[PDB]
């Protein structure tokens, strides 16, 4: 079944923002260098029927958050993630600390150049959750 | 001044007048000589007394109320009580304390007693217009109560949109007055309800209920040139005021100017920031020329002028290339043409999206419909086509397919060959391309003169569907027999007959509720289907029937009130089915009451 | 044939820990009305649940007696800059406060012998709370 | 008007022959649309190639992969099976043999129902006019 | 000679030539008052052809809307300008202070009112210079009523176009064009409090690369010690010799240079981030353990505290890889916790990682203080590296 | 701070009267 039930997976996240008594945000959104706090994006609620998606070489869960603006953000949770995931994420901090030169020149800015991390954060050192929309692909 | 027995005799007066006022009906609608003595009765009470005219008045309210729900023209009266009178608060504050008595049954009444509410209300807000510097102190009171009891109202009532016409007419009404300061407690109250409001009708009623939110969302009084800090409510009507609605546009055209004047251009950029995309998409599709209208579009050039580069600071490359889906897909087949040797192969779903707006449309022509309705119907029935074909001894296949389920380890025949895989995109567009399909024969129920041969097309495809389940049935004990085999032997890839597991909960959460109707109907044919074909001992455990009640429990954990409608639809049917048999209510009774509490608490 | 009481034997610690534990003060109002509601409807029942609670009483109490402008009412959610958002809940939170004392000063040697004058202590409460201006509250 | 209209395209139909290659070579070379160059006329285009075609009862899609047939997968139960021996006495021995006898007149598509259905599609949306154009012409 | 060469080529008009026949009915309701009122009809005409001309291109933008968007945005001020030299006629009886107020609300809604520093060079100039126009014409009204008021109401804020100009053409690498309109801002021959500081500064900034040009910028900074009105230019003076005293081989002069920079304001994080860079430009020679570090961080927490809501995490990451030597001696310890000035914590929130692994490394508890004051005022920014890193060090024990 | 002051009112026409330019062979 490519969409099961979040209630039947994990009955705490469907039942999580009427427990839920303040505003944690959307995991994530502090690295991507936006210079202040107040417009970031508030959990509201975690959809329902996440996704199941089999990829090549291995396979995973895709829930969505839906944003306290309208917004739902999807996430992969890599329950199996590798022990190298500090060296890619320090890549990925590395590459997206240079975004801010390339908006700066002239040259970069006309041709809208940008590096395109993702985003991954991890939850505890044996699962992390990257961004992942669907229309993802690979070739 | 007057004693007892003289103002009994102008109550009396007043009486008789106005019974006296059905000699000249028909035999803001009324005849000449009925006007003329409307006329006559208001300026001869104008000259009384007012602290005796109040009471008279006071006391014949109701009267007067009950006999304009049968000649209508009355209204007349109240109107010259209120547009020309020394007179004029006092039955001003008469008449709204007396409609906000009426203010409860105005949803759940008929459509003349609405009108007739409607335009009494609306005589009472052009009253305030008309006399500003005379009392509008008369409407201060009871006008947040106004606001709050129609949007409370509005919940519990038959016709709710009566309430929200209301509110719409208090807000054109007025605007460039002082009372907007006691209103500005109850705006963040009135936006979070507009707003939860505008999107959760994601199944729209098709109506101006979109239109009538976005224009109570924006359009709102306020002191201050800029309304408030609640200013991130309107972002997202602001959209739909630029977008959908070419009537709402010069509105909402008028709020963003009222935004880029005078915001300082550093505490509007980031509100804007969500939206910035849609709203200069819209914005760019009303710079058209002189046929369409240039006080829309110099409007826009006004906007975009005013804004230096930060018209186009906020645009990346775009992140909305369409990829094609299920209503862009092509559907091949074989046509004989006589200039031609052979068969060509051409597409038949050139025209489904085409199809699928003319059906939902209203306003087209019933020729026009039902000539769409049979278009979908052809490409449905070309997709069942090559199902349909049953075997000459189909009937005991059925009876032996249907008795070999009580039978425990099934011998698999085991053989080491691979077979093909399944092409996700393409079987998800075909898959959503049958559910379309589907779910516009249920809504062909909802016409009339198109309601027979969908309800008969409709009674064939379940009762086809409810045969075809039983090969999803036999295939699930793949799943057993061997707890890890792996050298079986499984047909290959197919749309597996589970798709009316989302046709069936589309149409009980359907925002009319006579494709609803056909939604529970549905569940009744297929429950006698399942309980035939199977006998009501295994039908509760293999048939639809426990799958399609899962189905029912997920409609109540959705994120809108229109889906847990449904799964309450589809709990309420499915209990006053199954009543007889203790096994299948008392094994599923944890996840059903855990649904219907999860009603109660998310709503 | 079953008591209310037997059907809580098993769960009722599940309902009471998580209300016991948490101070009542740092909890946004929602939850503060469902706590105290849940607490009247357990101790309207017959003859259960009265051991030990005389500290929550004392909070809710004195959580009461104090005015609600822009003081200790609230943690997080200030009340200068909201109208008609929290008044309401502010307003059920008063009337259910008052609820649960009318309730547990009905109950005998639960709060009326306890500390000599503690009955005397939120009868001063009950005579304070006739002075605000809503009628629902009166 | 739906009548008057349906008159003029069924003569003009009727004056043509009813070869691809003639109605083709009409459309382009020898019809002059001057007087309709408002209105899309690829829609009375479509309906002159339209007419050269066959009302053939037998049309059936070849690229969908359709829903699961009963004829083989009532023979995906290999050995262990009591096959039962004509039990003809039920209200199911009816249905089902109703239902087939429903089910065969119900899926026999001739192209006509197909050709004149789209016909009026195009006189609502000038975008079926444009996807019947591009999937016909280069056929 | 203007009028003939348009009305020869405005017929198969294009949106430019019918911008420049609204400039020139524009012209001539101004240098002839009680004009025409025109202006109103070309400037509809020309958003009427605008709009044909947008319709006819594709609907998504295209890079050719932009140009669009910039006519947009010239018949607006084509119209404001009209506004402008209405109320400009009516002041012929001495009513200043009394409409000068609608000019300077026009004016300021026009300097707000500039293209993106991205875009092209041509729209720049094509801005600036219509500009131009607008303000000699009321220059040329403001000349007779000077001598009559017995500062003063004649603007010349023409420089302020020429200035924004000067500056982003030194963003688009056109270092001759950014020399070469700095020589029209010598028409009034008085030393402005805007405009001598943004000339100057921009000219010391023209002779910054092309190495031998430096000397270009070191002798007309070192000859002007007269103050232009402010006691801020002459601090980034100094610190301008600091620089291009530092880009040759100096060790002390550069060094002292930077010293008299710093000591009259301690309010230019520029003099502080450029004695930090030089500080690290003379580590560059040298092993970093040496003592000489301690001023470099000491320069660049100070070039942190108030250079605040800009690009400093460069600065950041130099402190986090200068405090990492193998010091002996406390004196790096002393210069990071003698800094006397709040901390920009929320800009180390994107080095939590490397604070975070920077706890397992020794010599380092002044790390402590900056994830305690993260910890206490953004939260949600270390909870989930926090507990990674601690499951991963719980199972290691 | 959060306002700014009042922009110049740009008066858009109401009873504009253009011509709808015929095509060129360009």
Same mark, same amino acid.
């Given at each position: 079944?490519?969409?099961?039930?979040?209630?039947?997976?994990?009955?705490?996240?469907?039942?999580?923002?009427?427990?839920?008594?303040?505003?944690?945000?959307?995991?994530?959104?502090?690295?991507?260098?936006?210079?202040?706090?107040?417009?970031?994006?508030?959990?509201?609620?975690?959809?329902?029927?996440?996704?199941?998606?089999?990829?090549?070489?291995?396979?995973?869960?895709?829930?969505?958050?839906?944003?306290?603006?309208?917004?739902?953000?999807?996430?992969?949770?890599?329950?199996? @993630?590798?022990?190298?995931?500090?060296?890619?994420?320090?890549?990925?901090?590395?590459?997206?600390?240079?975004?801010?030169?390339?908006?700066?020149?002239?040259?970069?800015?006309?041709?809208?150049?940008?590096?395109?991390?993702?985003?991954?954060?991890?939850?505890?050192?044996?699962?992390?959750?990257?961004?992942?929309?669907?229309?993802?692909?690979?070739? | 001044?007057?004693?007892?027995?003289?103002?009994?005799?102008?109550?009396?007066?007043?009486?008789?007048?106005?019974?006296?006022?059905?000699?000249?009906?028909?035999?803001?609608?009324?005849?000449?000589?009925?006007?003329?003595?409307?006329?006559?009765? @208001?300026?001869?009470?104008?000259?009384?007394?007012?602290?005796?005219?109040?009471?008279?008045?006071?006391?014949?309210?109701?009267?007067?109320?009950?006999?304009?729900?049968?000649?209508?023209?009355?209204?007349?009266?109240?109107?010259?009580?209120?547009?020309?009178?020394?007179?004029?608060?006092?039955?001003?504050?008469?008449?709204?304390?007396?409609?906000?008595?009426?203010?409860?049954?105005?949803?759940?009444?008929?459509?003349?007693?609405?009108?007739? +509410?409607?335009?009494?209300?609306?005589?009472?807000?052009?009253?305030?217009?008309?006399?500003?510097?005379?009392?509008?102190?008369?409407?201060?009171?009871?006008?947040?109560?106004?606001?709050?009891?129609?949007?409370?109202?509005?919940?519990?009532?038959?016709?709710?949109?009566?309430?929200?016409?209301?509110?719409?007419?208090?807000?054109?009404?007025?605007?460039?007055?002082?009372?907007?300061?006691?209103?500005?407690?109850?705006?963040?109250?009135?936006?979070?309800?507009?707003?939860?409001?505008?999107?959760?009708?994601?199944?729209?009623?098709?109506?101006?209920?979109?239109?009538?939110?976005?224009?109570?969302?924006?359009?709102?009084?306020?002191?201050?040139?800029?309304?408030?800090?609640?200013?991130?409510?309107?972002?997202?009507?602001?959209?739909?005021?630029?977008?959908?609605?070419?009537?709402?546009?010069?509105?909402?055209?008028?709020?963003?100017? +009222?935004?880029?004047?005078?915001?300082?251009?550093?505490?509007?950029?980031?509100?804007?920031?969500?939206?910035?995309?849609?709203? *200069?998409?819209?914005?760019?599709?009303?710079?058209?020329?002189?046929?369409?209208?240039?006080?829309?579009?110099?409007?826009?050039?006004?906007?975009?002028?005013?804004?230096?580069?930060?018209?186009?600071?906020?645009?990346?490359?775009?992140?909305?290339?369409?990829?094609?889906?299920? +209503?862009?897909?092509?559907?091949?087949?074989?046509?004989?043409?006589?200039?031609?040797?052979?068969?060509?192969?051409?597409?038949?779903?050139?025209?489904?999206?085409?199809?699928?707006?003319?059906?939902? *449309?209203?306003?087209?022509?019933?020729?026009?419909?039902? *000539?769409?309705?049979?278009?979908?119907?052809?490409?449905?029935?070309?997709?069942?086509?090559?199902?349909?074909?049953?075997?000459? &001894?189909?009937?005991?296949?059925?009876?032996? @397919?249907?008795?070999?389920?009580?039978?425990?380890?099934?011998?698999?025949?085991?053989?080491?060959?691979?077979?093909?895989?399944?092409?996700?995109?393409?079987?998800?567009?075909?898959?959503?391309?049958?559910?379309?399909?589907?779910?516009?024969?249920?809504?062909?129920?909802?016409?009339?003169?198109?309601?027979?041969?969908?309800?008969?097309?409709?009674?064939?495809?379940?009762?086809?569907?409810?045969?075809?389940?039983? &090969?999803?049935?036999?295939?699930?004990?793949?799943?057993? &027999?061997?707890?890890?085999?792996?050298?079986?032997? &499984?047909?290959?890839?197919?749309?597996?007959?589970?798709?009316?597991?989302?046709?069936?909960?589309?149409?009980?959460?359907?925002?009319?509720?006579?494709?609803?109707?056909?939604?529970?109907?549905?569940?009744?044919?297929?429950?006698?289907?399942?309980?035939?074909?199977?006998?009501?001992?295994?039908?509760?455990?293999?048939?639809?029937?426990?799958?399609?009640?899962?189905?029912?429990?997920?409609?109540?954990?959705?994120?809108?009130?229109?889906?847990?409608?449904?799964?309450?639809?589809?709990?309420?049917?499915?209990?006053?089915?199954?009543?007889?048999?203790?096994?299948?209510?008392?094994?599923?009774?944890?996840?059903?009451?855990?649904?219907?509490?999860?009603?109660?608490?998310?709503? | 044939?079953?008591?209310?009481?037997?059907?809580?034997?098993?769960?009722?610690?599940?309902?009471?820990?998580?209300?016991?534990?948490?101070?009542?003060?740092?909890?946004?109002?929602?939850?503060?009305?469902?706590?105290?509601?849940?607490?009247?409807?357990?101790?309207?029942?017959?003859?259960?649940?009265?051991?030990?609670?005389?500290?929550?009483?004392?909070?809710?109490?004195?959580?009461?007696?104090?005015?609600?402008?822009?003081?200790?009412?609230?943690?997080?959610?200030?009340?200068?800059?909201?109208?008609?958002?929290?008044?309401?809940?502010?307003?059920?939170?008063?009337?259910?406060?008052?609820?649960? +004392?009318?309730?547990?000063?009905?109950?005998?040697?639960?709060?009326?012998?306890?500390?000599?004058?503690?009955?005397?202590?939120?009868?001063?409460?009950?005579?304070?709370?006739?002075?605000?201006?809503?009628?629902?509250?009166? | 008007?739906?009548?008057?209209?349906?008159?003029?395209?069924?003569?003009?139909?009727?004056?043509?022959?009813?070869?691809?290659?003639?109605?083709?070579?009409?459309?382009?070379?020898?019809?002059?649309?001057?007087?309709?160059?408002?209105?899309?006329?690829?829609?009375?285009?479509?309906?002159?190639?339209?007419?050269?075609?066959?009302?053939?009862?037998?049309?059936?899609?070849?690229?969908?992969?359709?829903?699961?047939?009963?004829?083989?997968?009532?023979?995906?139960?290999?050995?262990? @099976?009591?096959?039962?021996?004509?039990?003809?006495?039920? $209200?199911?021995?009816?249905?089902?043999?109703?239902?087939?006898?429903?089910?065969?007149?119900?899926?026999?598509?001739?192209?006509?129902?197909?050709?004149?259905?789209?016909? $009026?599609?195009?006189?609502?949306?000038?975008?079926?006019?444009?996807?019947?154009?591009?999937?016909?012409?280069?056929? | 000679?203007?009028?003939?060469?348009?009305?020869?080529?405005?017929?198969?008009?294009?949106?430019?030539?019918?911008?420049?026949?609204?400039?020139?009915?524009?012209?001539?309701?101004?240098?002839?008052?009680?004009?025409?009122?025109?202006?109103?009809?070309?400037?509809?005409?020309?958003?009427?052809?605008?709009?044909?001309?947008?319709?006819?291109?594709?609907?998504?933008?295209?890079?050719?809307?932009?140009?669009?968007?910039?006519?947009?945005?010239?018949?607006?001020?084509?119209?404001?300008?009209?506004?402008?030299?209405?109320?400009?006629?009516?002041?012929?009886?001495?009513?200043?202070?009394?409409?000068?107020?609608?000019?300077?609300?026009?004016?300021?809604?026009?300097?707000?009112?500039?293209?993106?520093?991205?875009?092209?060079?041509?729209?720049?100039?094509?801005?600036?210079?219509?500009?131009?126009?607008?303000?000699?014409?009321?220059?040329?009204?403001?000349?007779?009523?000077?001598?009559?008021?017995?500062?003063?109401?004649?603007?010349?804020?023409?420089?302020?176009?020429?200035?924004?100009?000067?500056?982003?053409?030194?963003?688009?690498?056109?270092?001759?064009?950014?020399?070469?309109?700095?020589?029209?801002?010598?028409?009034?021959?008085?030393?402005?409090?805007?405009?001598?500081?943004?000339?100057?500064?921009?000219?010391?900034?023209?002779?910054?690369?092309?190495?031998?040009?430096?000397?270009?910028?070191?002798?007309?900074?070192?000859?002007?010690?007269?103050?232009?009105?402010?006691?801020?230019?002459?601090?980034?003076?100094?610190?301008?010799?600091?620089?291009?005293?530092?880009?040759?081989?100096?060790?002390?002069?550069?060094?002292?240079?930077?010293?008299?920079?710093?000591?009259?304001?301690?309010?230019?994080?520029?003099?502080?981030?450029?004695?930090?860079?030089?500080?690290?430009?003379?580590?560059?020679?040298?092993?970093?353990?040496?003592?000489?570090?301690?001023?470099?961080?000491?320069?660049?927490?100070?070039?942190?505290?108030?250079?605040?809501?800009?690009?400093?995490?460069?600065?950041?990451?130099?402190?986090?890889?200068?405090?990492?030597?193998?010091?002996?001696?406390?004196?790096?310890?002393?210069?990071?916790?003698?800094? #006397?000035?709040?901390?920009?914590?929320?800009?180390?929130?994107?080095?939590?990682?490397?604070?975070?692994?920077?706890?397992?490394?020794?010599?380092?508890?002044?790390?402590?203080?900056?994830?305690? #004051?993260?910890?206490?005022?953004?939260?949600?920014?270390?909870?989930?590296?926090?507990?990674?890193?601690? $499951?991963?060090?719980?199972?290691?024990? | 701070?959060?306002?700014?002051?009042?922009?110049?009112?740009?008066?858009?026409?109401?009873?504009?009267?253009?011509?709808?330019?015929?095509?060129?062979?360009?």
């Amino acid at each position: 079944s490519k969409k099961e039930n979040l209630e039947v997976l994990c009955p705490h996240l469907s039942n999580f923002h009427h427990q839920k008594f303040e505003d944690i945000e959307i995991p994530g959104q502090y690295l991507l260098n936006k210079d202040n706090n107040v417009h970031f994006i508030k959990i509201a609620r975690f959809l329902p029927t996440v996704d199941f998606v089999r990829g090549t070489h291995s396979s995973y869960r895709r829930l969505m958050i839906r944003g306290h603006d309208g917004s739902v953000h999807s996430f992969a949770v890599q329950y199996p @993630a590798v022990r190298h995931s500090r060296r890619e994420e320090r890549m990925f901090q590395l590459y997206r600390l240079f975004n801010k030169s390339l908006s700066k020149n002239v040259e970069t800015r006309r041709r809208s150049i940008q590096f395109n991390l993702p985003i991954a954060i991890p939850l505890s050192p044996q699962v992390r959750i990257m961004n992942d929309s669907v229309s993802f692909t690979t070739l | 001044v007057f004693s007892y027995e003289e103002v009994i005799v102008f109550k009396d007066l007043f009486h008789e007048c106005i019974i006296g006022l059905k000699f000249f009906k028909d035999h803001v609608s009324a005849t000449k000589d009925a006007r003329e003595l409307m006329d006559y009765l @208001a300026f001869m009470f104008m000259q009384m007394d007012n602290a005796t005219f109040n009471e008279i008045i006071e006391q014949e309210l109701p009267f007067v109320y009950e006999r304009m729900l049968e000649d209508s023209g009355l209204l007349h009266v109240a109107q010259s009580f209120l547009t020309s009178e020394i007179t004029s608060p006092n039955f001003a504050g008469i008449l709204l304390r007396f409609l906000k008595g009426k203010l409860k049954d105005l949803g759940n009444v008929d459509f003349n007693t609405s009108n007739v +509410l409607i335009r009494l209300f609306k005589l009472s807000f052009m009253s305030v217009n008309l006399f500003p510097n005379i009392n509008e102190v008369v409407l201060l009171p009871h006008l947040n109560d106004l606001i709050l009891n129609s949007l409370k109202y509005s919940t519990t009532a038959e016709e709710p949109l009566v309430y929200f016409y209301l509110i719409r007419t208090l807000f054109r009404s007025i605007g460039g007055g002082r009372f907007e300061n006691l209103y500005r407690s109850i705006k963040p109250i009135l936006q979070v309800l507009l707003q939860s409001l505008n999107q959760m009708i994601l199944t729209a009623r098709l109506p101006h209920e979109r239109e009538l939110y976005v224009e109570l969302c924006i359009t709102v009084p306020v002191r201050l040139s800029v309304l408030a800090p609640y200013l991130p409510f309107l972002m997202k009507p602001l959209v739909f005021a630029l977008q959908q609605y070419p009537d709402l546009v010069s509105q909402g055209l008028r709020t963003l100017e +009222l935004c880029i004047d005078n915001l300082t251009a550093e505490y509007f950029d980031p509100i804007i920031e969500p939206v910035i995309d849609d709203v *200069s998409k819209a914005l760019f599709n009303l710079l058209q020329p002189q046929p369409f209208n240039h006080a829309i579009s110099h409007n826009v050039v006004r906007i975009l002028g005013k804004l230096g580069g930060r018209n186009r600071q906020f645009l990346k490359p775009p992140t909305d290339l369409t990829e094609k889906t299920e +209503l862009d897909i092509d559907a091949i087949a074989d046509f004989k043409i006589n200039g031609m040797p052979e068969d060509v192969p051409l597409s038949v779903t050139p025209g489904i999206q085409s199809a699928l707006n003319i059906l939902q *449309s209203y306003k087209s022509d019933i020729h026009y419909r039902k *000539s769409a309705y049979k278009y979908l119907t052809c490409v449905l029935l070309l997709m069942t086509k090559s199902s349909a074909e049953f075997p000459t &001894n189909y009937t005991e296949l059925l009876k032996t @397919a249907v008795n070999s389920i009580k039978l425990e380890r099934i011998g698999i025949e085991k053989n080491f060959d691979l077979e093909p895989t399944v092409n996700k995109r393409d079987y998800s567009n075909q898959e959503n391309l049958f559910l379309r399909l589907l779910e516009s024969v249920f809504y062909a129920t909802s016409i009339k003169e198109l309601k027979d041969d969908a309800m008969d097309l409709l009674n064939n495809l379940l009762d086809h569907f409810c045969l075809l389940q039983v &090969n999803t049935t036999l295939l699930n004990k793949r799943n057993y &027999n061997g707890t890890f085999n792996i050298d079986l032997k &499984n047909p290959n890839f197919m749309l597996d007959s589970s798709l009316i597991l989302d046709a069936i909960p589309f149409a009980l959460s359907y925002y009319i509720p006579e494709v609803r109707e056909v939604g529970v109907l549905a569940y009744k044919r297929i429950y006698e289907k399942s309980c035939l074909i199977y006998g009501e001992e295994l039908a509760l455990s293999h048939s639809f029937i426990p799958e399609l009640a899962k189905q029912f429990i997920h409609l109540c954990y959705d994120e809108t009130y229109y889906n847990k409608r449904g799964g309450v639809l589809g709990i309420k049917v499915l209990i006053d089915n199954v009543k007889s048999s203790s096994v299948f209510l008392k094994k599923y009774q944890y996840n059903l009451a855990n649904g219907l509490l999860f009603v109660l608490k998310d709503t | 044939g079953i008591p209310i009481v037997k059907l809580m034997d098993h769960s009722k610690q599940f309902l009471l820990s998580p209300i016991f534990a948490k101070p009542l003060r740092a909890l946004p109002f929602t939850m503060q009305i469902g706590n105290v509601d849940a607490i009247t409807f357990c101790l309207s029942l017959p003859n259960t649940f009265l051991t030990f609670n005389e500290e929550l009483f004392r909070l809710l109490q004195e959580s009461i007696v104090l005015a609600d402008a822009e003081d200790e009412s609230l943690s997080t959610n200030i009340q200068k800059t909201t109208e008609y958002s929290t008044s309401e809940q502010l307003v059920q939170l008063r009337i259910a406060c008052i609820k649960l +004392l009318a309730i547990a000063l009905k109950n005998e040697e639960f709060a009326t012998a306890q500390q000599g004058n503690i009955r005397i202590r939120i009868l001063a409460v009950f005579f304070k709370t006739m002075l605000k201006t809503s009628p629902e509250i009166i | 008007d739906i009548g008057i209209r349906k008159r003029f395209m069924t003569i003009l139909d009727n004056s043509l022959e009813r070869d691809i290659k003639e109605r083709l070579y009409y459309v382009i070379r020898d019809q002059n649309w001057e007087f309709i160059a408002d209105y899309p006329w690829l829609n009375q285009a479509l309906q002159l190639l339209y007419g050269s075609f066959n009302r053939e009862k037998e049309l059936s899609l070849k690229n969908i992969y359709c829903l699961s047939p009963p004829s083989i997968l009532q023979e995906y139960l290999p050995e262990n @099976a009591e096959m039962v021996t004509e039990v003809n006495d039920l $209200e199911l021995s009816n249905f089902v043999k109703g239902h087939i006898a429903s089910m065969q007149g119900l899926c026999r598509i001739i192209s006509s129902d197909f050709i004149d259905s789209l016909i $009026e599609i195009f006189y609502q949306d000038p975008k079926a006019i444009h996807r019947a154009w591009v999937t016909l012409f280069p056929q | 000679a203007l009028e003939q060469s348009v009305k020869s080529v405005m017929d198969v008009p294009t949106p430019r030539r019918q911008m420049f026949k609204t400039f020139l009915a524009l012209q001539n309701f101004a240098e002839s008052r009680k004009g025409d009122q025109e202006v109103r009809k070309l400037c509809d005409e020309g958003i009427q052809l605008s709009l044909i001309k947008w319709v006819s291109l594709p609907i998504r933008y295209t890079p050719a809307h932009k140009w669009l968007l910039h006519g947009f945005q010239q018949y607006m001020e084509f119209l404001e300008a009209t506004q402008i030299y209405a109320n400009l006629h009516t002041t012929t009886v001495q009513n200043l202070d009394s409409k000068a107020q609608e000019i300077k609300r026009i004016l300021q809604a026009w300097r707000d009112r500039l293209p993106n520093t991205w875009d092209d060079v041509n729209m720049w100039n094509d801005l600036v210079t219509w500009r131009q126009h607008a303000f000699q014409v009321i220059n040329n009204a403001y000349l007779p009523l000077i001598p009559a008021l017995q500062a003063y109401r004649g603007y010349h804020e023409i420089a302020w176009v020429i200035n924004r100009f000067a500056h982003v053409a030194r963003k688009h690498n056109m270092p001759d064009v950014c020399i070469s309109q700095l020589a029209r801002i010598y028409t009034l021959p008085n030393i402005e409090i805007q405009e001598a500081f943004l000339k100057l500064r921009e000219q010391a900034k023209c002779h910054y690369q092309n190495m031998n040009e430096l000397t270009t910028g070191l002798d007309v900074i070192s000859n002007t010690n007269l103050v232009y009105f402010g006691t801020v230019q002459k601090a980034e003076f100094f610190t301008l010799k600091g620089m291009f005293l530092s880009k040759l081989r100096a060790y002390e002069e550069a060094n002292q240079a930077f010293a008299t920079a710093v000591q009259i304001d301690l309010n230019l994080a520029k003099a502080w981030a450029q004695w930090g860079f030089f500080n690290d430009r003379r580590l560059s020679e040298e092993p970093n353990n040496i003592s000489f570090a301690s001023n470099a961080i000491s320069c660049y927490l100070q070039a942190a505290g108030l250079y605040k809501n800009s690009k400093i995490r460069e600065l950041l990451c130099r402190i986090l890889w200068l405090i990492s030597i193998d010091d002996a001696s406390g004196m790096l310890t002393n210069a990071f916790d003698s800094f #006397r000035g709040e901390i920009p914590v929320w800009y180390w929130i994107t080095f939590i990682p490397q604070l975070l692994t920077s706890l397992s490394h020794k010599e380092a508890n002044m790390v402590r203080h900056i994830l305690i #004051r993260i910890a206490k005022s953004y939260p949600q920014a270390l909870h989930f590296q926090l507990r990674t890193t601690k $499951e991963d060090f719980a199972v290691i024990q | 701070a959060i306002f700014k002051q009042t922009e110049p009112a740009i008066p858009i026409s109401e009873n504009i009267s253009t011509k709808t330019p015929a095509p060129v062979a360009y």
